Short mmCIF file of C-alpha atoms and ligand atoms in Angstrom, two decimals:
data_model
loop_
_atom_site.label_atom_id
_atom_site.label_comp_id
_atom_site.label_asym_id
_atom_site.label_seq_id
_atom_site.Cartn_x
_atom_site.Cartn_y
_atom_site.Cartn_z
CA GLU A 7 4.01 -2.36 -31.66
CA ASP A 8 3.11 1.32 -32.10
CA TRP A 9 1.51 3.05 -29.14
CA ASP A 10 -0.22 6.42 -28.98
CA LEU A 11 0.39 8.44 -25.83
CA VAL A 12 -3.21 9.43 -25.10
CA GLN A 13 -2.96 11.38 -21.84
CA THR A 14 -1.05 11.88 -18.59
CA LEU A 15 -2.33 9.74 -15.72
CA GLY A 16 -0.16 10.97 -12.87
CA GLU A 17 3.06 12.70 -11.92
CA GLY A 18 5.98 11.47 -9.84
CA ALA A 19 9.24 12.88 -8.53
CA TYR A 20 11.47 11.80 -11.40
CA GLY A 21 8.79 11.68 -14.09
CA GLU A 22 5.18 11.16 -15.16
CA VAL A 23 2.87 8.28 -16.02
CA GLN A 24 1.12 8.32 -19.39
CA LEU A 25 -1.72 6.25 -20.78
CA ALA A 26 -0.63 4.50 -23.96
CA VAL A 27 -3.01 2.86 -26.43
CA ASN A 28 -2.02 0.23 -28.98
CA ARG A 29 -2.75 1.46 -32.50
CA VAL A 30 -3.76 -2.03 -33.65
CA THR A 31 -5.23 -3.83 -30.64
CA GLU A 32 -6.44 -0.76 -28.73
CA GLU A 33 -4.93 -2.27 -25.59
CA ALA A 34 -4.28 0.33 -22.89
CA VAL A 35 -1.13 0.35 -20.78
CA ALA A 36 0.52 2.83 -18.43
CA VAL A 37 4.03 4.07 -19.21
CA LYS A 38 6.19 5.36 -16.34
CA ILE A 39 8.80 7.87 -17.54
CA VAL A 40 12.09 8.45 -15.69
CA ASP A 41 14.92 10.66 -17.01
CA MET A 42 17.93 9.22 -15.20
CA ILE A 52 14.81 2.94 -11.22
CA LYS A 53 17.19 0.03 -11.73
CA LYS A 54 15.88 -1.73 -8.62
CA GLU A 55 12.27 -0.80 -9.47
CA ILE A 56 12.58 -2.62 -12.79
CA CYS A 57 14.30 -5.58 -11.15
CA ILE A 58 11.61 -5.87 -8.50
CA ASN A 59 8.82 -5.39 -11.07
CA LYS A 60 10.23 -8.32 -13.06
CA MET A 61 9.54 -10.65 -10.10
CA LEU A 62 5.90 -9.61 -9.63
CA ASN A 63 2.97 -11.74 -10.76
CA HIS A 64 -0.23 -11.46 -8.73
CA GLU A 65 -3.79 -10.26 -9.32
CA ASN A 66 -3.53 -7.53 -6.64
CA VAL A 67 -0.20 -6.19 -7.86
CA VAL A 68 0.18 -3.96 -10.91
CA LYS A 69 1.56 -6.13 -13.74
CA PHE A 70 4.85 -5.38 -15.47
CA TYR A 71 4.93 -5.79 -19.27
CA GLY A 72 8.53 -4.72 -19.92
CA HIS A 73 10.78 -1.71 -20.43
CA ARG A 74 12.70 0.10 -23.17
CA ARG A 75 15.73 2.31 -22.46
CA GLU A 76 16.23 5.38 -24.65
CA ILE A 79 15.26 8.17 -20.19
CA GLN A 80 13.73 4.89 -18.98
CA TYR A 81 10.28 3.61 -20.02
CA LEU A 82 8.37 1.13 -17.84
CA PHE A 83 5.33 -0.63 -19.35
CA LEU A 84 2.80 -1.33 -16.60
CA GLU A 85 -0.77 -2.48 -16.05
CA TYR A 86 -3.33 0.27 -16.71
CA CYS A 87 -5.87 0.69 -13.92
CA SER A 88 -8.92 2.58 -15.22
CA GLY A 89 -10.69 2.74 -11.86
CA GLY A 90 -8.24 5.32 -10.53
CA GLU A 91 -6.87 5.31 -7.00
CA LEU A 92 -8.38 4.11 -3.74
CA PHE A 93 -7.74 7.58 -2.40
CA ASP A 94 -10.59 8.83 -4.61
CA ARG A 95 -13.13 6.33 -3.26
CA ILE A 96 -12.65 7.75 0.23
CA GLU A 97 -15.04 10.55 1.10
CA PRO A 98 -13.31 13.05 3.41
CA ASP A 99 -14.43 12.80 7.06
CA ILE A 100 -16.75 9.92 6.11
CA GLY A 101 -14.78 7.09 4.51
CA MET A 102 -16.74 4.51 2.54
CA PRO A 103 -19.29 1.77 3.31
CA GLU A 104 -17.81 -0.87 5.59
CA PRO A 105 -18.41 -3.76 3.14
CA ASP A 106 -16.41 -1.95 0.42
CA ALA A 107 -13.64 -1.22 2.92
CA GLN A 108 -13.55 -4.89 3.95
CA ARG A 109 -13.35 -6.11 0.37
CA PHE A 110 -10.55 -3.61 -0.39
CA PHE A 111 -8.73 -4.68 2.76
CA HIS A 112 -9.03 -8.39 1.81
CA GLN A 113 -7.47 -7.59 -1.55
CA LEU A 114 -4.72 -5.50 0.07
CA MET A 115 -3.78 -8.38 2.40
CA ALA A 116 -3.71 -10.76 -0.59
CA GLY A 117 -1.27 -8.46 -2.43
CA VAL A 118 0.88 -7.84 0.67
CA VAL A 119 0.97 -11.57 1.53
CA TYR A 120 2.21 -12.29 -1.99
CA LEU A 121 4.98 -9.68 -1.82
CA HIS A 122 6.16 -10.74 1.61
CA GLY A 123 6.07 -14.34 0.37
CA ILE A 124 8.65 -13.51 -2.31
CA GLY A 125 10.67 -11.45 0.16
CA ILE A 126 9.70 -8.02 -1.12
CA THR A 127 8.54 -5.11 1.06
CA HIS A 128 6.71 -2.20 -0.58
CA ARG A 129 7.58 0.36 2.12
CA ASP A 130 5.06 3.04 1.03
CA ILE A 131 1.59 1.53 1.20
CA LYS A 132 -0.99 4.32 1.11
CA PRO A 133 -4.28 4.93 -0.76
CA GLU A 134 -2.51 6.96 -3.46
CA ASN A 135 -0.54 3.81 -4.36
CA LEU A 136 -3.47 1.41 -4.30
CA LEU A 137 -5.09 1.47 -7.74
CA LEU A 138 -8.40 0.05 -8.99
CA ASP A 139 -9.05 -1.77 -12.27
CA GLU A 140 -12.32 -1.63 -14.24
CA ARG A 141 -13.99 -4.02 -11.77
CA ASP A 142 -12.65 -2.20 -8.70
CA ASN A 143 -10.03 -4.85 -7.98
CA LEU A 144 -7.25 -3.29 -5.90
CA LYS A 145 -3.69 -3.28 -7.29
CA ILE A 146 -0.56 -2.35 -5.35
CA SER A 147 1.52 0.03 -7.46
CA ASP A 148 4.85 1.90 -7.41
CA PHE A 149 7.82 -0.22 -6.38
CA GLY A 150 10.25 2.66 -6.52
CA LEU A 151 10.73 2.49 -2.76
CA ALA A 152 10.48 -1.28 -2.52
CA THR A 153 13.31 -3.53 -1.40
CA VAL A 154 14.26 -7.17 -0.81
CA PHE A 155 14.02 -8.11 2.87
CA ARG A 156 14.48 -11.88 2.48
CA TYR A 157 16.82 -13.76 0.19
CA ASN A 158 17.98 -17.37 0.24
CA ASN A 159 15.56 -17.70 3.14
CA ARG A 160 17.60 -15.28 5.23
CA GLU A 161 15.88 -12.15 6.55
CA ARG A 162 17.69 -8.84 6.47
CA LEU A 163 16.63 -6.04 8.83
CA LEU A 164 16.00 -2.62 7.35
CA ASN A 165 17.60 0.64 8.49
CA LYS A 166 16.74 3.22 5.84
CA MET A 167 13.89 5.57 6.67
CA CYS A 168 11.39 5.83 3.84
CA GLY A 169 7.66 5.93 3.22
CA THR A 170 5.16 8.68 4.11
CA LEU A 171 4.99 10.03 7.70
CA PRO A 172 1.27 9.54 8.42
CA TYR A 173 1.61 5.90 7.25
CA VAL A 174 4.94 4.84 8.79
CA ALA A 175 5.29 2.59 11.81
CA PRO A 176 6.71 4.12 15.00
CA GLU A 177 9.75 1.78 15.06
CA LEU A 178 10.96 3.27 11.79
CA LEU A 179 11.26 6.61 13.58
CA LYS A 180 12.75 5.29 16.84
CA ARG A 181 14.93 2.26 16.09
CA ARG A 182 18.15 2.00 14.10
CA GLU A 183 17.05 -1.35 12.67
CA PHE A 184 13.64 -2.92 12.23
CA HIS A 185 11.82 -5.84 10.59
CA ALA A 186 10.21 -5.10 7.21
CA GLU A 187 6.93 -6.98 7.55
CA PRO A 188 5.43 -5.27 10.61
CA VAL A 189 6.02 -1.92 8.90
CA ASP A 190 3.81 -2.81 5.90
CA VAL A 191 1.25 -4.26 8.34
CA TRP A 192 1.10 -0.91 10.17
CA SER A 193 0.59 1.11 6.98
CA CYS A 194 -2.22 -1.30 5.98
CA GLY A 195 -3.84 -0.43 9.31
CA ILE A 196 -3.55 3.30 8.60
CA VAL A 197 -5.14 2.62 5.18
CA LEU A 198 -8.04 0.75 6.83
CA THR A 199 -8.56 3.69 9.24
CA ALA A 200 -8.72 6.09 6.30
CA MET A 201 -11.23 3.89 4.45
CA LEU A 202 -13.48 3.69 7.52
CA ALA A 203 -13.19 7.25 8.86
CA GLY A 204 -12.14 9.31 5.87
CA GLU A 205 -9.33 10.86 7.87
CA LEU A 206 -5.78 10.03 8.93
CA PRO A 207 -5.37 9.61 12.69
CA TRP A 208 -2.01 11.44 13.08
CA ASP A 209 0.75 13.44 11.33
CA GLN A 210 3.23 10.80 12.51
CA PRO A 211 3.36 8.11 15.23
CA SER A 212 5.71 9.82 17.66
CA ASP A 213 5.43 10.69 21.36
CA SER A 214 5.39 14.40 20.49
CA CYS A 215 2.26 13.82 18.42
CA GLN A 216 -0.80 14.43 20.59
CA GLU A 217 -3.20 12.35 18.47
CA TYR A 218 -0.86 9.38 18.67
CA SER A 219 -0.50 9.79 22.44
CA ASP A 220 -4.31 9.79 22.69
CA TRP A 221 -4.43 6.52 20.77
CA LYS A 222 -1.85 4.88 23.07
CA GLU A 223 -3.98 6.06 26.00
CA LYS A 224 -6.97 4.43 24.27
CA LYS A 225 -9.14 7.53 23.96
CA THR A 226 -11.23 5.85 21.26
CA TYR A 227 -14.13 8.18 22.06
CA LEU A 228 -12.26 10.73 19.93
CA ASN A 229 -12.02 10.96 16.12
CA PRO A 230 -11.30 9.10 13.96
CA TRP A 231 -11.93 6.10 16.22
CA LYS A 232 -15.46 7.07 17.23
CA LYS A 233 -16.59 6.83 13.60
CA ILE A 234 -15.41 3.22 13.45
CA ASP A 235 -17.58 0.28 14.49
CA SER A 236 -16.30 -1.83 17.38
CA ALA A 237 -15.48 -4.86 15.20
CA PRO A 238 -13.07 -3.22 12.69
CA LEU A 239 -11.85 -1.06 15.60
CA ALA A 240 -10.81 -4.20 17.52
CA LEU A 241 -8.73 -5.22 14.49
CA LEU A 242 -7.16 -1.75 14.41
CA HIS A 243 -6.28 -2.14 18.11
CA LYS A 244 -4.21 -5.21 17.07
CA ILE A 245 -2.48 -3.61 14.06
CA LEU A 246 -1.64 -0.15 15.42
CA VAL A 247 0.42 -1.61 18.26
CA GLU A 248 3.62 0.34 18.99
CA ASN A 249 5.87 -2.66 19.67
CA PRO A 250 6.50 -4.26 16.25
CA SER A 251 7.18 -7.59 17.99
CA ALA A 252 3.74 -7.57 19.65
CA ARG A 253 1.94 -6.33 16.51
CA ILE A 254 -0.52 -8.73 14.87
CA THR A 255 0.86 -10.64 11.86
CA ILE A 256 -1.00 -11.22 8.65
CA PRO A 257 -1.80 -14.87 9.36
CA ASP A 258 -3.51 -13.68 12.57
CA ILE A 259 -5.25 -10.81 10.76
CA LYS A 260 -6.81 -13.50 8.52
CA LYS A 261 -8.23 -15.04 11.70
CA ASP A 262 -9.68 -11.70 12.91
CA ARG A 263 -13.40 -11.61 13.60
CA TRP A 264 -14.19 -8.52 11.49
CA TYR A 265 -11.87 -9.72 8.72
CA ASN A 266 -14.11 -12.81 8.54
CA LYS A 267 -17.47 -11.06 9.02
CA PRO A 268 -19.96 -11.51 6.17
CA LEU A 269 -20.96 -8.01 5.01
CA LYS A 270 -23.26 -5.98 2.74
N1 LIG B 301 -1.38 7.96 -7.94
C1 LIG B 301 -1.84 7.31 -9.18
C2 LIG B 301 -1.78 8.28 -10.38
C3 LIG B 301 -2.29 7.60 -11.65
N2 LIG B 301 -1.43 6.44 -11.90
C4 LIG B 301 -1.92 5.31 -12.55
N3 LIG B 301 -3.11 5.46 -13.14
C5 LIG B 301 -3.66 4.49 -13.87
N4 LIG B 301 -3.02 3.36 -14.07
C6 LIG B 301 -1.79 3.16 -13.56
N5 LIG B 301 -0.97 2.11 -13.63
C7 LIG B 301 0.15 2.36 -12.96
C8 LIG B 301 1.28 1.59 -12.73
N6 LIG B 301 2.29 2.06 -12.01
C9 LIG B 301 2.24 3.27 -11.48
C10 LIG B 301 1.13 4.09 -11.66
C11 LIG B 301 0.05 3.63 -12.41
C12 LIG B 301 -1.17 4.16 -12.83
C13 LIG B 301 -0.01 6.81 -11.95
C14 LIG B 301 0.41 7.50 -10.66
O1 LIG B 301 -0.38 8.68 -10.46
#
């Protein structure tokens, strides 16, 4: 019942996250502090999956969210700049990311800001999707609603979000998962944003894969990236088809 605030884990816009330890059980949890979030709590209440940060509850005093503590830090910190990480680790992380994203989409939730900073690791390096502050419902009563608000993080957002007034939620999270995979395999982000004024993005659309970061990436995972980082959201590979991808299914290590 009584928790000691041991240390700060991370900072956010509207607050900070602190590690809290139970005085009796010594259980660790993370506490997200927000000095007024209503939708974040609501969405968190729906979530129950092994690749999504668990929600234990909240107390209003300033709002306090009680969330799963992930001692392994963030995926961001397993990526060596300009190098990435070993391909078998990247594949395992990507499998776990798809599992989390499939779950969310299955309950009609889109995260909207998938990036390595938001993908946390537990003590066994299991990936956990965190931070549902930008998340929203895109399906309800089996009826899809198109999105129109721009949010997320420029290097990770899909090009339709910049160009179209309305867009489907799922292909946007698929795209950001592809940017995450690129980062894991090349240790660099391919562009500032996916717009026609961005030279690196133009190069990609013209298939200059002899340039970085694409030249650091083996042809198998690169063929999967060619299917994810497709400009037309309607032509973009879906998750069920990602699960059928050759590299996705390649035994590694
Ligand atoms: N960018 C990550 C860092 C450290 N971080 C975390 N660190 C450890 N465990 C956590 N569990 C969480 C549940 N929800 C949100 C965040 C965490 C969290 C907080 C954010 O800044």
